[PDB]
Amino acid sequence: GSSGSSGKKKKKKDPNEPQKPVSAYALFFRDTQAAIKGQNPNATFGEVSKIVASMWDGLGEEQKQVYKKKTEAAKKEYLKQLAAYRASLVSKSYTDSGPSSG
What DSSP string runs through 68-81?
HHHHHHHHHHHHHH
Element (H, E) at 62: helix 61-89
Q: What angle do the packed helices 45-56 and 29-39 form, to 10 degrees?
A: 130
51: three-class secondary structure by DSSP: helix
Domains in the chain: ranges and CATH: 1-102 (1.10.30.10)
